[PDB]
Amino acid sequence: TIKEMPQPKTFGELKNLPLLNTDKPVQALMKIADELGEIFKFEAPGRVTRYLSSQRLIKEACDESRFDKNLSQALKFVRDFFGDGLVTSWTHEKNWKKAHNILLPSFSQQAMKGYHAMMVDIAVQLVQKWERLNADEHIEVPEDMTRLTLDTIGLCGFNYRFNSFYRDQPHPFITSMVRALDEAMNKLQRANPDDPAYDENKRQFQEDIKVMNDLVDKIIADRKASGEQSDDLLTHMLNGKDPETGEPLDDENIRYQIITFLIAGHETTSGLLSFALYFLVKNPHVLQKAAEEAARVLVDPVPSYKQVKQLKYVGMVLNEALRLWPTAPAFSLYAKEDTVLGGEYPLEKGDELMVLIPQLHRDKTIWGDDVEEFRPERFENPSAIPQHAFKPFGNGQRACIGQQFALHEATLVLGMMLKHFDFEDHTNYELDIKETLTLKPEGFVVKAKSKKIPLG
Ligand code: HEM
Ligand SMILES: Clc1ccccc1C(c1ccccc1)(c1ccccc1)n1ccnc1
């Protein structure tokens, strides 16, 4: 029977908006979902979203005959930067399907086998950094994972070396992007955007845009000028033709894809590796099991592609980390036509739904009562997981194109970490989840005692 949709508390003309006046809006939305259940309406001035949290409703929203990928408010905002790249394009935009067809071969098994050696290059730099620490020095986990994941996408994707392990501070490209996005957001909150007090902000913004454009120019120019032509993501961007049309990407779209992939390729994976290490050091029985697997499988000085595929329990650790804290914590959908969701909630054409992935992943009707515990064995039998219960990589044709890249990199790196070191949660770290568009365990630190096993 038709039901009235719960809605949290309203503040006059501001509606629900100031419930998100917090540095942890996703964690706030989870608490609302705890109070109101599987679906709730959330209104801001001029905007309406419905937040879904149950597998039963999310399964229906994932029916692509009824619902398509929506560009949420955050996606429409970052579209100013990522244009009609794969992430920030509508499914019905010609450049989506075209780039999808051209770039999908960059994530084939053959391509993955080709990325493996370059992933090992960066993973070795990570291990060697930690091997080289003096006594009593600790590791800043998310910081080092970010160094790794940035360098991995740069190298595997574009043959560009960020050399993040040679720097104290983040690469200027990252700093520029962060500061440009922060400025663009601050702009929207300024009562008087033409106040001369903001002149320096505007000048800084142009400089930051130029840092980003200079890197994209260099990545393209160095490839075109090189004697080596390689076979990577950039190769397909520059040369690949859409089989449906015979056309290659145009120059403008290529530039959007490059920055799209540089950003997509690193920060969500960095958080995954950080959360996985967090859970491991908090669950010493799981850590021992994972470490036993790493020692038994990784019998050569550097892992091979096939050995990474054999790290089954490491893979389950990573899925269980993505269950609890999926590092892209939502994706957005809209109703293609008028329709009724769950036989209970009528929707008009165009209505937006937000999939609240952390809350999906805590649906007790699917996972049982222990949803807050870290138990990788939940994934021991993959056929037992109902479809649409586990969605850290989105849905359908708009699912993450890089999912296998991310997981292969993370499995490789976590395996090598577990082979080469014993880890200590020397501060008894208290989980504090810092939110941007992603999630990270802020201030997570550990010590790594080397097992003195040499690399190749
Ligand atoms: C743990 C790591 C990752 C997570 C959690 C993640 C998550 C997601 C999710 C949820 C989407 C769907 C977005 C939406 O529906 O609006 C998505 C799309 C995408 N991801 Fe990822 N991602 C990860 C890693 C990567 C990596 C390593 C790359 C690139 C090498 C990548 C590139 C993309 C692209 C290009 C899309 C857009 C696909 C399309 O619609 O054509 N992601 N990702
Ligand atoms: Cl937001 C964004 C912009 C450009 C590329 C990728 C992504 C996205 C993401 C999410 C959180 C923090 C940084 C990037 C993302 C966009 C929309 C919905 C989910 C994730 N992403 C990273 C990996 N795959 C997709």
Residue numbers in the entry: 1 to 456
Give the article text.
The crystal structures of the BM3 DM heme domain were solved in their complexes with the azoles clotrimazole, voriconazole, fluconazole and tioconazole. In so doing, the azoles ligate to the ferric heme iron of the WT heme domain through nitrogen atoms. This occurs through imidazole nitrogens for clotrimazole/tioconazole, and through a triazole nitrogen for fluconazole. For all the azole-bound structures reported in this study, the hetero-aromatic nitrogen ligand is oriented so as to fit within the groove of the I-helix formed between Ala264 and Glu267/Thr268. The voriconazole, clotrimazole and tioconazole structures contain multiple monomers in the asymmetric unit, and in each case the general protein conformation corresponds to the “open”, substrate-free conformation of the enzyme, with little significant difference in protein or ligand conformation between monomers. With the exception of the heme-ligand interaction, most contacts established with the protein are of a hydrophobic nature. In the case of clotrimazole, one of the most hydrophobic ligands, two additional 2-methyl-2,4-pentanediol (MPD) molecules derived from the mother liquor were observed to interact both with the ligand and the protein. As binding titrations and EPR studies were conducted without MPD or similar compounds, MPD is clearly not needed for azole binding. However, X-ray crystallographic analysis revealed single occupancy of the azole ligands for each of the structures solved.
Among the bacterial P450s, one of the best characterized enzymes is the Bacillus megaterium CYP102A1 (P450 BM3), which Armand Fulco’s group identified as a fatty acid hydroxylase that could catalyze the hydroxylation of saturated fatty acid substrates, primarily at the ω-1, ω-2, and ω-3 positions. P450 BM3 (BM3) is a natural fusion of a cytochrome P450 (N-terminal) to a FAD-, FMN- and NADP(H)-binding cytochrome P450 reductase (CPR). More recent work in our group has used the double mutant (DM) form of the flavocytochrome P450 BM3 enzyme (F87V/A82F), in which the first mutation expands available substrate binding space in the active site, while the second mutation is more distant from the heme but causes a structural readjustment in the P450 that alters its conformational state. We also report the first structures of the BM3 DM heme domain in complex with four different azole drugs, confirming the greater plasticity of this variant and its ability to structurally adapt to bind to several azole drug compounds.
